[PDB]
Amino acid sequence: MDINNKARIHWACRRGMRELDISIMPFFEHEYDSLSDDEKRIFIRLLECDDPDLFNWLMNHGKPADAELEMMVRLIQTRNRERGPVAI
Structure with a gap:
């Protein structure tokens, strides 16, 4: 999977879990283009990790x-x- 097939990466951002969907998808849709090429390649590789790990990382229960x-x-x-929403 490489960095310029955005539709394929988009698909890879659809996760089995709600908390991840709300995190990874919108990041991709709003932020992916703004990444360096090296950052894009790394993000693609992140998407190959399992959901239990991604959720732990995103919640800061340890780290990769x-x-x-x-x-x-x-x-x-x-x-x-x-x-995201700035909440009073």
Whole structure:
């Protein structure tokens, strides 16, 4: 899977779990284009991880041993945090 077939990556962003759908999909739709090529490649590889791990990482119950994956998880968190609803 590579970086310029956006429709295929989009599909790969549909997860079996609700909390992930709301995290990974919107990140992709709003943020993917803004990534470096290296960031895109890493994000694609992140998408091959299992949902139990992605959910733990995104909730910060630990983190990936792979530092590239750790950096991508953190970029998702940062971008999602800034885009989402500001709640009083």
